[PDB]
Amino acid sequence: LLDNLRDTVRKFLTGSSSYDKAVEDFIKELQKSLISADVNVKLVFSLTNKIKERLKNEKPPTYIERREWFIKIVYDELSNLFGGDKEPKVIPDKIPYVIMLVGVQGTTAGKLAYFYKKKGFKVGLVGADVYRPAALEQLQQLGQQIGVPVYGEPGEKDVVGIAKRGVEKFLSEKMEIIIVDTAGRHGYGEEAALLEEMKNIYEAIKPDEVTLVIDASIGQKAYDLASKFNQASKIGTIIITKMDGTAKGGGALSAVAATGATIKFIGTGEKIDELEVFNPRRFVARLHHHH
């Protein structure tokens, strides 16, 4: 989406036709690209109308070209569409810190532990995603690869029992950050039951933070789950993964941003270090035409 917007911006800036037509052409392409990115049409409509409004009430400051000013407003609103200028708190000031990852069926846990280990923390991983049999093995592999301890119980399906014993074990070893990987028995469209199912695990572990992992490929359909999730607790955060393996990342981000939830990290690639702290302003700044 942003890479495509980059070319649209370029065509706009290289003053080809009349200003008015240039703007019209640009807005149509923006609308089309956003639609293609699975952004809710209502959000697309509101975004372009807000851009057009600001453009009529805010003349360019002196010395600033009209076309440069237009784009500046476009970048500002794109950032807003994704949540606005906001830098999340990624370094906990409470040790030990227990993070419970949750989400629908279908690396993030390993990436998160890697992120914190690189920051100098003593991390412990708990593999409590029993539904997926390969999950535990995979986790143990990531853990071995990054030098982070992984607790797990082969064949065990009592997710709550695993999480409790795992957290208890790491708390005893005086780990600083403990990440519990869990999944869920439901998918998108069954949010009510999904969240319900989360409660039991949460009560047994009493995590300091609950992080809902969302695959960017779900696009705008992530709205319902994110909305109910964020209202469900005061300690909830979200991670959007596989942003590069889909064209619907814009829809997922905008859908989640529409709930006001805190998107702390975004998963870019499949590599262990491909997890970045997310800030809509910085996310949108990557494609600025002046660098």
**What residue spans define the domains of the chain?**
1-86, 87-277
184 assigned ligand-binding residue: yes
* Cβ-based neighbours of 112, under 8 Å, separated by 6 or more: 99, 101, 179, 211, 239, 265, 275
110 assigned ligand-binding residue: no
Other Cβ atoms closer than 10 A to 16: 10
Paired with 124 in beta bridges are: 178
Other Cβ atoms closer than 10 A to 134: 9
- 286 burial level (CB within 10 Å; 0-12, 13-18, 19+): exposed
Are 108 and 269 in contact, with CB atoms under 8 Å apart? no
> How many angstroms separate the CA atoms of 186 and 184, rounded?
6
Sheet harboring 236-241: ordered strands across? Answer: 150-151, 123-127, 177-181, 97-102, 209-215, 236-241, 263-267, 275-277
- Nearest Cα to 123, choosing from 134, 135, 109, 137? 109
Residues in the chain: 291
Are 200 and 160 in contact, with CB atoms under 8 Å apart? yes
Paired with 75 in beta bridges are: none
275-277 and 263-267 beta bridge pairing = antiparallel
- Nearest Cα to 267, choosing from 127, 103, 145? 103
260 assigned ligand-binding residue: no
185 assigned ligand-binding residue: yes
> How many angstroms separate the CA atoms of 123 and 282, rounded?
28
243 assigned ligand-binding residue: yes
Paired with 241 in beta bridges are: 215
Q: Just give the CATH number of 87-277.
A: 3.40.50.300
> How many angstroms separate the CA atoms of 132 and 136, rounded?
8
Coil vs helix vs strand at 157: coil
181 assigned ligand-binding residue: yes
103 assigned ligand-binding residue: yes
Torsion from C-alpha of 17, 19, 25, 29, nearest 10 degrees: 120
Strands (E), 94-176: 97-102, 123-127, 150-151
Q: Just give the CATH number of 1-86.
A: 1.20.120.140
Single-letter amino acid, residue 81 = L
- Nearest Cα to 204, choosing from 263, 146, 235, 158? 158
* Cβ-based neighbours of 48, under 8 Å, separated by 6 or more: 27, 30, 31
236-241 and 209-215 beta bridge pairing = parallel
- Resolution for the entry shown, Å: 2.0
242 assigned ligand-binding residue: yes
> How many angstroms separate the CA atoms of 2 and 34, rounded?
10
